[PDB]
Design a protein around this ligand. Structure first.
Ligand SMILES: COc1cc(C(=O)NCCc2cccs2)cc(OC)c1OC
Length: 124
């Protein structure tokens, strides 16, 4: 069975909006979303649908771009670094669950390179 997806709101967590977080939604996330390899990453891994009964037996900090998008829309994050950490968790989860050379890993590697390209320079 699937675990609950990561929270996208939390009333006792303080919220914040910054220029860098606005950019992370408007430019970084919304650009990566349109990439031809983004589709595996647009929603939480559904282990029942995808027939990955070991996924959440291996991956204990799940993350995906649909969750990140909702978090950005809700001003869930305190700063850009917190959001960037969720992207990095999403990519590393893929590398951990799989192995080098797998099609899904080739997709994550390409997306990670584009992500790094986009966050290399952030607004002030
Ligand atoms: C989001 O992370 C993952 C997503 C998928 C996924 O959508 N699989 C559907 C068919 C595919 C297989 C190869 C390319 S896409 C598979 C993974 O591992 C098999 C992942 O990593 C855990």
């Amino acid at each position: 069975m699937n675990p609950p997806p990561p929270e996208t709101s939390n009333p006792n967590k303080p919220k914040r909006q910054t220029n860098q977080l606005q950019y992370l939604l408007r430019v970084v996330l919304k650009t990566l979303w349109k990439h031809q390899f983004a589709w595996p990453f647009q929603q939480p891994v559904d282990a029942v649908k995808l027939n990955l009964p070991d996924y959440y037996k291996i991956i204990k900090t799940p993350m995906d771009m649909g969750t990140i998008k909702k978090r950005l829309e809700n001003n869930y994050y305190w700063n850009a670094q917190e959001c960037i950490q969720d992207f990095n968790t999403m990519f590393t989860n893929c590398y951990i669950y799989n192995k080098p050379g797998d099609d899904i890993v080739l997709m994550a590697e390409a997306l990670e390179k584009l992500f790094l390209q986009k966050i290399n320079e952030l607004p002030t």
